[PDB]
DNA sequence: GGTCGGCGCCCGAACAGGGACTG
DNA sequence: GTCCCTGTTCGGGCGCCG
């Protein structure tokens, strides 16, 4: 098969990211997979004259002694849409990375796919390989496998025009309004289709509005917290007014003193309860800008998010509620969170969002791979937030 | 011999050209050994004589070896290195004896003149020109940037058949140093060892018997490995009476290196003595606490200590224990009072922090280091109350976590030193605080008003808006009683104080912490600034006087 | 004395990010 | 924007190994 020439963006050198400590089982699975991938000619050992490196690890999927190798290609991906899919009852995600392995990679570009397997207690220098085929996890892999995949899926689509088949990185999203069961059987028909060449519910995705407390008594303190939350929200909803509630405070009251809600105050508050129901105005998705996702920990396995692009122009605001046990793993919850949110952002826009994680960076990187399950890795950065925004999206 | 292994292709940086540095003044004994080397290497094909078609030169020199009898022929390629292409280093860290499994039979051995047994790339050999008081390298020179990485890559390529056909002999491979373990009887062991020396020879790699250790205690990587214990080779501390920045550095380095088997080492005070300096030579007076820290470390180092080896059958355990001033010591064992290794964590991450954040940071450090050495995570023994941890990761807005652990009553115990109420206190005086400061003059004010009529305004000089905000909080803490409600409009201060710190680089915040520990109920509330909400409004008119508008 | 690479620690310099401020 | 404060990274010195 002929090879497509590929080049980096101008004035960018390839990636030079150090490989981070793997665990014994992750290393052993990586080495098994890698020796068989060398036996099959997909990868070739390389030396230290290649100065490019991208990290590598591996994941275990649920209840199957199969491991999956993950290359962290986002640094390289940097250097290189079916809007009805959000509307299907059932949506299955299929892994189809193996397919890329059947197409060669531009030789000029293989030195950029370079990666190093580590070894326990450094028994051994890093063992380095580069890719001969298209790699699982790279931006260009589906780009090039384009025409091949439109061919492969022509007959299945023509046969089932009410189905949606989206592709992003190593994943294929198949969505249909079929019954559960008929849906699954159609999916098995698609798997049998793919094996001739060689579970989500978007209907039930809800936005979480900002909501105001309902009380019978109001204290100086409750009203200051209300006015603060409204003052902030006015930056999203300009219809928010706080005149009357404010004027009720006027003067140097003790936090615990109770204030009674004047008629104008109670009406301003009910009108502001309304205004927070109308959706946000003037928020259009820009494909040429990055999606940004902020995640707040509200405690009790409660995690709120907003996806936006321009500040205050929230494309979506959501929440993610898990087990409130005494054995809650906050990191585990966070990664599960960011994976769910990345799925939403892909299904809705076909783009991954850059995350603003509430976590010490070291804490994140130590564990976050222990709980990953998806074939892509979204960008992220770490924040040191005030619980102001935290207090605003509370419930 | 010269390995018939293919030479790693090496180029230079675009638009660069070889070194043209000329020899420096050289003692003879060095030149005598230089020529005695150079000529035997020329005999062996390791350096080849060049003429004037080669415009390049680089300084050479020599040093004694660990032997101290022989000589290391070093070249000074600062310029060539600056101009050679970039590599990807393959040495990813140092092996640690505490990640050695118990083997029935062991050998350590070292390779005969190793760099000089591996072929440089021909098209590059020219920039390796030198003149002894004119040759070029046909092998790997010492002092060149690419020689480590290249050697190590290569040595791995070579050993790869042996490891493939002998997957049950473990070969720890640092530079040319090889530790070899097997579960065979000593007889069959030495058989497999001779088989490996034969393999290395086949690739042109001699294992001089002079460095072929057959009996314990195997000297390896700075340790002595006995069959069931290991220990670090003896450590000697600098015992000056006037210390300088460099005397200090080497002292802390010896200490840090010790801390890996000597539990309890402490370096924060000494290290703090290094703050602000300029040159290596600045002599500096030991403070009484640095002096005493040194005393107790010295006291520690006199005792005997040894690690054991790693059993994968047993669990890994890390226990952590607290010293002062954000210092922490941990011990990783598998079986009580049988240290696999020890350590210490002291890093100060944050302007403000508390013992609980530091403990978690320590846990992360140990987890990453355990993964490196043994590939798995230890179970923990930690001096923090299951309740203190539940409360903490309850209220704290950041994701945070600690793998499987258990409490151990080993004072000092870790606790949060105070707590902020969730709801405002009935009967507690309510302080509306604020500060403001002028950007040109650096003049400001900070103060409060209270629902009970009191109001105070303090002037400050050479201050900052944030500083004034903290000053007003501090004031309010100073003048209130054992219960007080505080309302500030400075999410910076709120953000510090909710975090529940107990140490701060800032003195203001330390005074603030002292106050917060003294009280019995504090409630700290926020309101948006400059929005006419009493009595934020009154205090803001109070401090904005003379310093704003 | 004077070279190289890796890792550790520790410090300081140079960044990036975000909140409060002036007329 | 400027100023202020927090965080991260990167490079400098020492240590340790070859
Ligand atoms: C591989 C390897 C070796 C092994 O050491 P060795 O101390 O065993 O020396 P050797 O070459 O093996 O000779 P022998 O063992 O017969 O005495 O490490 C390297 N080495 C060591 C010190 C040293 C330095 N001060 N600067 C530089 Cl840039 N490289 C250095 C090169 C040497 O080849
Ligand atoms: Mg040697
Ligand atoms: Mg203010």
CATH code at B334? 3.30.70.270
Cβ proximity of B200 and B111 under 8 Å: yes
Contact of B393 with chain A, judged by CB distance below 8 Å, is answered with yes
Residue boundaries of the structural domains of chain A:
143-203, 218-275, 291-392
Domains contained in chain B, number: 4
Torsion, Cα of B460, B466, B471, B472 (10° steps): 110
Q: DSSP letter for B6, please.
A: P
If you measure from the C-alpha of residue B142 to the centroid of ligand 1, how many angstroms do you get, rounded to a whole number? 8
Phi-psi region of B273 (alpha: psi -120 to 50; beta: other; left: phi over 0): alpha
Residue B211 burial (10 A CB sphere; 0-12, 13-18, 19+): middle
> How far apart are the C-alpha atoms of A40 and A30, rounded to whole Å?
15
Cβ proximity of B37 and B116 under 8 Å: no
- A219's CB contacts (< 8 A; 6+ apart) are A255, A256, A257, A258, A259, B424
Which residue among A122, A297, A332 places its CB closest to the CB of B95?
Answer: A122
Pick the closest to residue B493 from B476, B517, B509 (CA basis). B509
Contact of B170 with chain A, judged by CB distance below 8 Å, is answered with yes
Residue B13 placed within a domain: no
Count contacts between A and B (CB, < 8 Å). 214
Instruction: Give me the sheet containing B483-488, strands edge to edge.
Output: B455-461, B443-450, B429-437, B483-488, B521-526
- B298's CB contacts (< 8 A; 6+ apart) are B237
β-pairing, B379-382 with B317-322?
A: parallel
β-pairing, A291-299 with A353-357?
A: parallel
Pick the closest to residue A215 from A184, A252, A260, A176 (CA basis). A260
B146–A363 C-beta distance less than 8 A = no
Helix runs in B203-343, H state only: 245-258, 268-272, 288-301
Cβ proximity of B270 and B248 under 8 Å: yes
- A105's CB contacts (< 8 A; 6+ apart) are A3, A6, A113, A131, A132, A133, A134, A135
> How far apart are the C-alpha atoms of A66 and A59, rounded to whole Å?
9
Beta-bridge partner residues of A304: A296, A319
Q: How far is CA B149 from CA A34, A75, B12, B152, B175, in A?
A: 22, 24, 16, 5, 9
> How far apart are the C-alpha atoms of A392 and A389, rounded to whole Å?
5
Question: Are B487 and B511 within one domain?
Answer: yes
- Whether the beta carbon of B253 falls within 7 A of nucleic chain D: the reply is yes
Question: Are B142 and B190 within one domain?
Answer: yes
> How far apart are the C-alpha atoms of B384 and A162, rounded to whole Å?
58
- Whether the beta carbon of B176 falls within 7 A of nucleic chain D: the reply is yes
User: In ligand 1, which atom is closest to the CA atom of B63?
Assistant: 25
Cβ proximity of A232 and A207 under 8 Å: no
**Nucleotides of strand D lying closer than 7 angstroms to a protein CB:** 3-9, 13-18
Q: Is the dihedral of CA B193, B198, B203, B208 positive or negative?
A: positive
If you measure from the C-alpha of residue B367 to the centroid of ligand 2, how many angstroms do you get, rounded to a whole number? 34
What was the resolution (in A) of this experimentally determined structure?
Answer: 2.7
Tokens of B175: 């530079």
Asked which of B301, B328, B344 is the last residue of a domain, the reply is B301
Instruction: Detail the DSSP E strand segments found in B489-533.
Output: 503-504, 521-526
Phi, psi of A334 (to 5 degrees): -65, -45
C23 nearest neighbour residue (CA to C1')? B549
Q: DSSP letter for B30, please.
A: H
- A154's CB contacts (< 8 A; 6+ apart) are none
Residue B416 placed within a domain: no
Tokens of A163: 């189905």
Angle at A59 between CA A54 and CA A63, to 5 degrees: 170
Say what angle helices A140-159 and A182-194 make with each other, to 10 degrees: 120
Chain-centroid distance, C-alpha A169: 13
- Residue nearest to ligand 1 atom 3, measured at CA: B114
Question: Are B166 and B71 within one domain?
Answer: yes
Cis preceding linkage at B535, omega within 30:
yes
> Which chain A positions have a beta carbon within 8 Å of B364's beta carbon?
360, 362-363, 366
> How far apart are the C-alpha atoms of B141 and B19, rounded to whole Å?
14
Tokens of B488: 């500030």
Matching fold, domains A218-275 and A291-392: yes
Report the SS3 class of residue B165. Answer: helix
- Whether the beta carbon of B472 falls within 7 A of nucleic chain D: the reply is no
> How far apart are the C-alpha atoms of B395 and B375, rounded to whole Å?
33
List, comma-separated, the residues after which chain B is broken, a break being a C to N distance over 2.5 A; otherwise answer none: 133
> How far apart are the C-alpha atoms of B533 and B538, rounded to whole Å?
9
- Which residues 331-360 of chain B have a CB under 7 Å from nucleic chain D? 349-352
First-to-final CA distance of chain B = 85
Phi, psi of B402 (to 5 degrees): -140, 120
> How far apart are the C-alpha atoms of B363 and B371, rounded to whole Å?
12
Say what angle helices B245-258 and B288-301 make with each other, to 10 degrees: 40
Question: Are B272 and B322 within one domain?
Answer: no
Q: Which residues line ligand 1 (CB under 6 A)?
A: B 65, 70, 72, 74, 110-115, 142-143, 151, 175-176
> How far apart are the C-alpha atoms of B57 and B20, rounded to whole Å?
5
Q: How far is CA B17 from CA A119, B57, B128, B150, in A?
A: 37, 12, 12, 21
Pick the closest to residue A128 from A111, A140, A141 (CA basis). A111
- B436's CB contacts (< 8 A; 6+ apart) are B444, B445, B446, B465, B468, B540, B543, B544, B547, B548
Question: Are B275 and B203 within one domain?
Answer: no
Tokens of B147: 């020689």
Cβ proximity of A130 and A114 under 8 Å: yes
Report the SS3 class of residue B256. Answer: helix
> How far apart are the C-alpha atoms of A297 and A301, rounded to whole Å?
8
H helix or E strand, kind and range, residue A389? helix A387-392
| Beta carbons within 10 angstroms of residue B209's beta carbon | 11
Report the SS3 class of residue A126. Answer: coil
Question: Are B74 and B176 within one domain?
Answer: yes
Residue B284: which domain range? Answer: 243-301
Positions at the binding site of A: 95, 170-171
Residue B81 burial (10 A CB sphere; 0-12, 13-18, 19+): middle
Residue B420 placed within a domain: no
Pick the closest to residue A20 from A379, A361, A279 (CA basis). A361
User: For tokens 């949110």, what's the residue?
Assistant: A341
Beta-bridge partner residues of B105: B182
Question: Are B75 and B107 within one domain?
Answer: yes
Q: How far is CA A369 from CA A20, A66, A76, B126, in A?
A: 11, 16, 19, 47
- A129's CB contacts (< 8 A; 6+ apart) are A34, A38, A43, A44, A45, A46, A114, A115, A117
Q: DSSP letter for A359, please.
A: B
Say what angle helices B355-374 and B386-395 make with each other, to 10 degrees: 100
Residue B117 burial (10 A CB sphere; 0-12, 13-18, 19+): buried
Phi, psi of A20 (to 5 degrees): -100, 155
- Residue B489 among known ligand-binding residues: yes
Tokens of B253: 């380095």
- B259's CB contacts (< 8 A; 6+ apart) are B265, B267, B329, B342, B343, B344
> How far apart are the C-alpha atoms of B188 and B211, rounded to whole Å?
21
* Ligand 1, pocket-test mutation among B113, B114, B117, B174, most atoms within 8 A of CB: B114
Tokens of A42: 């997909």
Residues in chain B: 549
Rounded to a whole number, what is the distance in Å from the CA of B357 to chain A's nearest CA? 10
- Which residues 288-307 of chain B have a CB under 7 Å from nucleic chain C? none
Phi, psi of A362 (to 5 degrees): -55, -50
> How far apart are the C-alpha atoms of B230 and B223, rounded to whole Å?
7
Angle at B110 between CA B104 and CA B112, to 5 degrees: 145
Question: Are B155 and B247 within one domain?
Answer: no
First-to-final CA distance of chain A = 57
Q: DSSP letter for B260, please.
A: T
Å from the A19 CA to the C4 C1': 22
| Beta carbons within 10 angstroms of residue B42's beta carbon | 15
Pick the closest to residue A212 from A295, A280, A262, A269 (CA basis). A269
CATH 3.30.70.270 fits A143-203, yes or no: yes
Q: DSSP letter for B353, please.
A: E
> What's the topology of domain A218-275?
Alpha-Beta Plaits (3.30.70)
CATH code of the domain covering residue B158: 3.10.10.10
Residue B418 placed within a domain: no
Residue B548 placed within a domain: no
Residue B398 placed within a domain: yes
Pick the closest to residue A357 from A374, A339, A376, A375 (CA basis). A339
Question: Are B258 and B380 within one domain?
Answer: no
Tokens of A239: 């219809």
Question: Are B32 and B168 within one domain?
Answer: yes
CATH code of the domain covering residue B495: 3.30.420.10
User: In ligand 1, which atom is closest to the CA atom of B67?
Assistant: 17
Asked which of B181, B198, B225 is the last residue of a domain, the reply is B225
3-state secondary structure B467-496: HHHHHHHHHHHHHCCCEEEEEECCHHHHHH
β-pairing, B317-322 with B443-450?
A: unpaired
Phi, psi of B99 (to 5 degrees): -115, 30
Angle at A353 between CA A180 and CA A395, to 5 degrees: 75
Residue A116 burial (10 A CB sphere; 0-12, 13-18, 19+): buried
> How far apart are the C-alpha atoms of B138 and A87, rounded to whole Å?
68
Q: What is the widest separation between alpha-carbon atoms in chain A? A: 80
Cβ proximity of B108 and B213 under 8 Å: yes
Say which CATH class A291-392 falls into.
alpha beta
Helix runs in B146-287, H state only: 146-165, 186-202, 245-258, 268-272
> How far apart are the C-alpha atoms of A354 and A364, rounded to whole Å?
15
Question: Are B125 and B257 within one domain?
Answer: no
Tokens of B405: 């652990």
Rounded to a whole number, what is the distance in Å from the CA of A40 to chain B's nearest CA? 18
Instruction: Detail the DSSP E strand segments found in chain A.
Output: 43-45, 56-60, 67-71, 90-95, 115-117, 127-131, 164-168, 171-176, 218-219, 258-259, 291-299, 302-308, 314-321, 353-357, 380-382
Chain-centroid distance, C-alpha B14: 35
> How far apart are the C-alpha atoms of B40 and B139, rounded to whole Å?
14
Q: How far is CA B333 from CA B41, B100, B384, B459, in A?
A: 49, 13, 20, 57
Residue B233 placed within a domain: no
Cβ proximity of B173 and B196 under 8 Å: no
> How far apart are the C-alpha atoms of B524 and B385, rounded to whole Å?
26
A24–B375 C-beta distance less than 8 A = yes
Q: DSSP letter for A134, please.
A: P
- Residue B540 among known ligand-binding residues: yes
> How far apart are the C-alpha atoms of A316 and B189, rounded to whole Å?
66
> How far apart are the C-alpha atoms of B177 and A160, rounded to whole Å?
64
Question: Are B70 and B215 within one domain?
Answer: yes
Asked which of B178, B198, B225 is the last residue of a domain, the reply is B225
Residue B422 placed within a domain: no
């Amino acid at each position: 098969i002929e090879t497509v020439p590929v080049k980096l963006k101008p004035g960018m050198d390839g990636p030079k990211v150090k490989q981070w400590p793997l665990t014994e089982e992750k290393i052993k699975a990586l080495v098994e997979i890698c020796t068989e991938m060398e036996k099959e000619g997909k990868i070739s050992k390389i030396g230290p004259e290649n100065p490019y490196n991208t990290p590598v690890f591996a994941i275990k999927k649920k209840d199957s002694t199969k491991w999956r190798k993950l290359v962290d290609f986002r640094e390289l991906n940097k250097r290189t849409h079916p809007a009805g899919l959000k509307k299907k009852k059932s949506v299955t995600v299929l892994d189809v990375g193996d397919a890329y392995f059947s197409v060669p990679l531009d030789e000029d570009f293989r030195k950029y796919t370079a990666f190093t397997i580590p070894s326990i207690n450094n028994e051994t220098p890093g063992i380095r390989y580069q890719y001969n085929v298209l790699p699982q996890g790279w931006k260009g892999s589906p780009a090039i496998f384009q025409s091949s995949m439109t061919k492969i899926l022509e007959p299945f689509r023509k046969q089932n025009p009410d189905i949606v088949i989206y592709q992003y990185m190593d994943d294929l999203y198949v969505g249909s309004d079929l019954e559960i069961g008929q849906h699954r059987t159609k999916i098995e028909e698609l798997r049998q289709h793919l094996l001739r060449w060689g579970e989500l519910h978007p209907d039930k995705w809800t936005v979480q509005p900002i909501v105001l407390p309902e009380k019978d008594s109001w204290t100086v303190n409750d009203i200051q917290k209300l006015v603060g939350k409204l003052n902030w929200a006015s930056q999203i909803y300009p219809g928010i007014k706080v005149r009357q509630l404010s004027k009720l405070l006027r003067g140097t009251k003790a936090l615990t003193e109770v204030i009674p809600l004047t008629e104008e105050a109670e009406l301003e508050l009910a009108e502001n309860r309304e205004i927070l129901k109308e959706p946000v105005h003037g928020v259009y998705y820009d494909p040429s800008k990055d999606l940004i996702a902020e995640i707040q920990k509200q405690g009790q396995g409660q995690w709120t998010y907003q996806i936006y692009q321009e500040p205050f122009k929230n494309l979506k605001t959501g929440k993610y509620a898990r087990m409130r046990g005494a054995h809650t793993n906050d990191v585990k919850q966070l990664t599960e969170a960011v994976q769910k949110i990345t799925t939403e952002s892909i299904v809705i826009w076909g783009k991954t969002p850059k995350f603003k994680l509430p976590i010490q960076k070291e804490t994140w990187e130590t564990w976050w791979t222990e709980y990953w399950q998806a074939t892509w890795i979204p960008e992220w950065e770490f924040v040191n937030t005030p619980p102001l925004v935290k207090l605003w999206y509370q419930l | 011999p010269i390995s018939p292994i293919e030479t790693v292709p090496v180029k230079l940086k675009p638009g660069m050209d070889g070194p043209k540095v000329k020899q420096w003044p050289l003692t003879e004994e060095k030149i005598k050994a230089l020529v005695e080397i150079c000529t035997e290497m020329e005999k062996e094909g390791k350096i080849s004589k060049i003429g004037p078609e080669n415009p390049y030169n680089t300084p050479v020199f020599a040093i004694k070896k660990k032997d101290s009898t022989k000589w290391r022929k070093l070249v000074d390629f600062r310029e060539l290195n600056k101009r050679t292409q970039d590599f990807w280093e393959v040495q990813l860290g140092i092996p640690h004896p505490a990640g050695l499994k118990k083997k029935k039979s062991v050998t350590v051995l070292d390779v005969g003149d190793a760099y000089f047994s591996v072929p440089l790339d021909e098209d590059f050999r020219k920039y390796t020109a030198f003149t002894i008081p004119r040759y070029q390298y046909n092998v790997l020179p010492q002092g060149w940037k690419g020689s480590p990485a290249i050697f190590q890559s290569s040595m791995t390529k070579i050993l790869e058949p042996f490891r493939k056909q002998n997957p049950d002999i473990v070969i720890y491979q640092y530079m040319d140093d090889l530790y070899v373990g097997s579960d065979l009887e000593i007889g069959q062991h030495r058989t497999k060892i001779e088989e490996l020396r034969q393999h290395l020879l086949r690739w042109g790699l001699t294992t001089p018997d002079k460095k072929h250790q057959k009996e314990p205690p195997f000297l390896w990587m700075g340790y002595e490995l006995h069959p069931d214990k290991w220990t670090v080779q003896p450590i000697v501390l600098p015992e000056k009476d006037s210390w300088t920045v460099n005397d200090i550095c080497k002292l802390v380095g010896k200490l840090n290196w010790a801390s890996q088997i000597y539990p309890g080492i402490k370096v924060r005070q000494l290290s703090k003595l290094l703050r602000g300096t300029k040159a290596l030579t600045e002599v500096i007076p030991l403070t009484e606490e640095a002096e005493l820290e040194l005393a107790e470390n010295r006291e520690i180092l006199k005792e005997p200590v040894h690690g054991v080896y790693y059993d994968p059958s047993k669990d890994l355990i890390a226990e952590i224990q607290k010293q002062g001033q954000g210092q922490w010591t941990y011990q990783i064992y598998q079986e009580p009072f049988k240290n696999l290794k020890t350590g210490k964590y002291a890093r100060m991450r944050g302007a403000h922090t508390n013992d609980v954040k530091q403990l978690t940071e320590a846990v992360q450090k140990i987890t990453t280091e355990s993964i490196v050495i043994w590939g798995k995570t230890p179970k923990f023994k930690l001096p923090i109350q299951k309740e203190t941890w539940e409360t903490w990761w309850t209220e704290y807005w950041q994701a945070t976590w600690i793998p499987e652990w258990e409490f151990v009553n080993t004072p000092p115990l870790v606790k949060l030193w105070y707590q902020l109420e969730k709801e405002p206190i009935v009967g507690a005086e309510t302080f509306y605080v604020d500060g403001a400061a002028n950007r040109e003059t650096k003049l400001g004010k900070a103060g409060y008003v209270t629902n009970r009529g009191r109001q105070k305004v303090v002037t400050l000089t050479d201050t900052t808006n944030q500083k004034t905000e903290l000053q007003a909080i501090y004031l309010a803490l100073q003048d209130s009683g054992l219960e007080v409600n505080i309302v500030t409009d400075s999410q910076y201060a709120l953000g510090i104080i909710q975090a529940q710190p107990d140490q701060s680089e800032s003195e203001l915040v330390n005074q603030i912490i002292e106050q917060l520990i003294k009280k019995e109920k504090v409630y700290l509330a926020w309101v948006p600034a400059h929005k006419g909400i009493g009595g934020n409004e009154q205090v803001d008119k109070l401090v904005s006087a003379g310093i704003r508008k």
